[PDB]
């Protein structure tokens, strides 16, 4: 059957704050609101800047997750602001799995859904 939703905190993006002269990392809370368990996955678009952790996991029913979205240094004068978003999958766990994530749920016949969170950066 088809993956119930999640929320996440913050909702719809992620704002990063200057100064980018150090790093930063800041956070996001998934939800899973749906009924069955679920496995997750997380990307970002920008991999020599930003990080995600933990980059997969499960979630039973209501359980929360607290991730890291991490922020390196860079020139916000000069270099790439735009197009950055971080992406999280997640489908339903198949039927009397463990509790660790198996990328081999994502791969077989079913179901993924998706939500993108863009990254905005207030200078």
Known sequence: ???????TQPSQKIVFNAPY?????YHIKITNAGGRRIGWAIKTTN?????????CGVLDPKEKVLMA??????????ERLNNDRITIEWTNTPDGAAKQFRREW??????????????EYNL
């Open 21 to 25: 002269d150090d790093k930063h990392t």
């Open 47 to 55: 991999m020599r800047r930003l990080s995600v952790d933990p980059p």
């Open 69 to 78: 979205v991490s922020c390196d240094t860079f020139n916000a004068a000069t």
């Open 106 to 119: 994502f791969q077989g016949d079913g179901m993924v859904r998706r939500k993108n969170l863009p990254i």
């Open 1 to 7: 059957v088809p993956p119930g939703d999640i929320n």
